[PDB]
Curated annotation (Swiss-Prot), chains A, B, C:
It comes from the Eukaryota. It comes from Rattus norvegicus (Rat). Its main location: secreted. Oligomeric complex of 6 set of homotrimers. It is found in: Secreted; Secreted, Extracellular space, Extracellular matrix; Secreted, Extracellular space, Surface film. This is Pulmonary surfactant-associated protein A.
Length: 145, 145, 145
């Protein structure tokens, strides 16, 4: 009806106001349909995954250059490396998203992936490039929604 | 129409992104259809009620074990007791929600309600159990929306 | 349909919960259909405009007494003056919103606008009244959404 068109407009406006506020305050970065955010904590991979799922999201993983740059800006902001949502396959060198699917977009630092002790996790340097490492380090927790 | 199904999906996604961000940042706890949040202030009952209504919510009151535990986690988090949304009836011993209705779910500390000077308000200990007290103490303000 | 009426209700509830949380935490002030918010930064006019647009909003401009008072409360809160969304016309004395339209609601401090060196920008004193000044000062950035 006509009353429906009105309600949707207000609802859309309100969402746009709340997201604008969170953005202005630096609580989140929006890229396309994805929203990235961090709780400022620096913990290991398992802990990050838990924190994000508990917040109703998932450990962040860039799938485009723009997404990768948004996460990179957060890592730079906190002067810390970020663990990404991906892990090495059974056969070293290959990586897959946490759902199993194989990674498509990649931004490895030159020479990487270079598995010392079978580097299973992936960290993002502050310049945005990736390094495959182990998963017990303390890294900035960044989630995507 | 079909364009309507699309709009609703995006709107639902966005809300889920903003709530995810607030959750990740510890600004609010969601339990079922209820959201709890605190402004970190420790003031008396009247002041808490005003703050919550002014924010478009109400002084929190647990109606299920899960809700009670969520509030308890916030009280523990701030290492302070929380005033709950309920007050003693005209006849001591009985308590009612702020709308008048009688309390159903209760989690009194053993021995409570124990009205010294006609304990009218109800505070939540950090372990989640309740104690009926007076209303002039300074307690953590927790609201529900 | 009937399932639509239900979805809208939940969506409206959720938005009301997120806005309630932001309000309680002092992250934003709602006035009618307008939301004001600040990132706590004190920068010049050009910088403020950029910050707000980047957040999906615009440098704040009061169009009613109530809106003016809400912004005034924020300026008082941070003990700093706020640059408003308006600039002086080609012919001194006249001011227009950033879209070109001429200002309607005004709250000039007695004697203002008083253009010393052709005061082009407008700042809000902590009492809510306005003073036309230059645009290079460092003022609290307040956006509207
Ligand atoms: Ca490596
Ligand atoms: Ca007692
Ligand atoms: Ca002047």
């Amino acid at each position: 009806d006509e009353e429906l068109q009105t309600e949707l407009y207000e609802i859309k406006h309100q969402i746009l106001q709340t997201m604008g506020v969170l953005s202005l305050q630096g609580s989140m970065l929006s890229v396309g349909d994805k929203v990235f955010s961090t709780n400022g904590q620096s913990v290991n991979f398992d802990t990050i995954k838990e924190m994000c799922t508990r917040a109703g999201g998932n450990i962040a993983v860039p799938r485009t250059p723009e997404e990768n740059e948004a996460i990179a800006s957060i890592a730079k902001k906190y002067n810390n490396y970020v663990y990404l949502g991906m892990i090495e396959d059974q056969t070293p060198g290959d990586f897959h998203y946490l759902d199993g699917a194989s990674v498509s977009y990649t931004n490895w630092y030159p020479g990487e992936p270079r598995g010392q002790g079978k580097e299973k996790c992936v960290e993002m340097y502050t310049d945005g490039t990736w390094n495959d490492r182990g998963c017990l380090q303390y890294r900035l927790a960044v989630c995507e929604f």
